[PDB]
Amino acid sequence: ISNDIAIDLGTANTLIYQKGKGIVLNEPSVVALRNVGGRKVVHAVGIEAKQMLGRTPGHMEAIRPMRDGVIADFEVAEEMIKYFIRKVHNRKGSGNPKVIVCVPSGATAVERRAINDSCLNAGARRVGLIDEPMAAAIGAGLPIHEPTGSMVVDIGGGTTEVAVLSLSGIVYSRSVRVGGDKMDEAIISYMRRHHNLLIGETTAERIKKEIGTARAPGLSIDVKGRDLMQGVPREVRISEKQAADALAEPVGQIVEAVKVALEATPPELASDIADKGIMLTGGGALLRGLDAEIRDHTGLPVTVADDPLSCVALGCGKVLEH
Numbered sequence: 001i002s003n004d005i006a007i008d009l010g011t012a013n014t015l016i017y018q019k020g021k022g023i024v025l026n027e028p029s030v031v032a033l034r035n036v037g038g039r040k041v042v043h044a045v046g047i048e049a050k051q052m053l054g055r056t057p058g059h060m061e062a063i064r065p066m067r068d069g070v071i072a073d074f075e076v077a078e079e080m081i082k083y084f085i086r087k088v089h090n091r092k093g094s095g096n097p098k099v100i101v102c103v104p105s106g107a108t109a110v111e112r113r114a115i116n117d118s119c120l121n122a123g124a125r126r127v128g129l130i131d132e133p134m135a136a137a138i139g140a141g142l143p144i145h146e147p148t149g150s151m152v153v154d155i156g157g158g159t160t161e162v163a164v165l166s167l168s169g170i171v172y173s174r175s176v177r178v179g180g181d182k183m184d185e186a187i188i189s190y191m192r193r194h195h196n197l198l199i200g201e202t203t204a205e206r207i208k209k210e211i212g213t214a215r216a217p218g219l220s221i222d223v224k225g226r227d228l229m230q231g232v233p234r235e236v237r238i239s240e241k242q243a244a245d246a247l248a249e250p251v252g253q254i255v256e257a258v259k260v261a262l263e264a265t266p267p268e269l270a271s272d273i274a275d276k277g278i279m280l281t282g283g284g285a286l287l288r289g290l291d292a293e294i295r296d297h298t299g300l301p302v303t304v305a306d307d308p309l310s311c312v313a314l315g316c317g318k319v320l321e322h
């Protein structure tokens with residue numbers, strides 16, 4: 001029994017894999033803070049904190065400290081990390097925990113040092129950082145040890161990360177701040193402007209999951225929220241076609257990010273990718289029809305990973321075990 005862990009520190013969700021056990025934590029990357037005196041104290045982390053989004057009293061806030069793929073608040077991020085690490089600790093396990101944390105290509109030296117330090121402050125004896133797209137690829141079952149290039153497109157909350165890998169190494173990587181959050185935000189903007197209804201970010205995510213799609217059909221759901229002009233609560237019906245229209249902008253931006261990456265690919269790797277095509281991972285890959293949109297605009301085969309939300313955690317878990 002071990003306390004060694006591998007951590008997917010996502011913009012929206014954090015997952016921990018524990019050596020010998022598998023994925024033992026999967027919670028929103030959210031911290032709720034309460035004002036006391038002039039100080040902010042940690043009130044909740046993870047599942048409860050996300051439920052507080054859009055629902056806080058004045059003396060509280062709920063924050064996503066990694067929301068845009070950068071560390072927005074080092075102290076809150078460190079509190080989040082230490083909370084999750086402490087939550088999975090097994091008193092029956094060995095000490096001197098080794099901790100692997102997945103790092104997106106664009107993370108800065110300052111951010112990497114901060115994550116290292118948070119892990120040490122949580123009781124880690126050793127901290128290893130591994131490249132996140134390597135983790136995503138391994139978790140998606142890509143044979144990244146082969147010479148032939150593989151492309152992974154990882155659509156998360158706050159970012160989409162594209163990488164080309166070969167022989168166990170990253171050859172190209174690019175990050176854009178378009179992903180699941182931009183999709184939610186487009187649905188929010190759509191509801192405001194077309195239906196005069198103000199909706200919360202959690203409701204927007206629910207709409208995206210239930211009726212969202214990258215391609216117009218159709219079916220309909222009830223959407224409740226705040227009236228734009230007068231403020232009274234009310235509800236409207238929204239269809240798949242409407243949701244498609246809402247999501248078209250961020251979908252197009254994701255497709256463009258994939259095109260930009262492809263365009264940077266040198267000849268031999270382009271040949272490789274022309275054969276194998278593109279692997280989608282991340283929760284954004286669950287958007288109905290996104291694979292088809294990418295295929296259509298690139299002319300390349302597009303596959304959706306098995307269990308796209310868990311690919312990175314599964315991948316670094318594999319690395320942890322070996």
Ligand SMILES: Nc1ncnc2c1ncn2[C@@H]1O[C@H](COP(=O)(O)OP(=O)(O)O)[C@@H](O)[C@H]1O
Binds near residue numbers: 283
């Ligand atoms: N069924 C779904 N359809 C579309 N998007 C989804 C679905 N399920 C989850 N998502 C989105 O995936 C994103 C989370 O992806 P994830 O890979 O966990 O991101 P991160 O690693 O950055 O935390 C969120 O924007 C979430 O709303």
Ligand SMILES: N=C(N)SCc1ccc(Cl)c(Cl)c1
Binds near residue numbers: 009068
């Ligand atoms: N994992 C993501 N793709 S976004 C959050 C994030 C940002 C910087 C670092 Cl070092 C880390 Cl470890 C994590």
Ligand SMILES: [Mg+2]
Binds near residue numbers: 154312
């Ligand atoms: Mg991720």
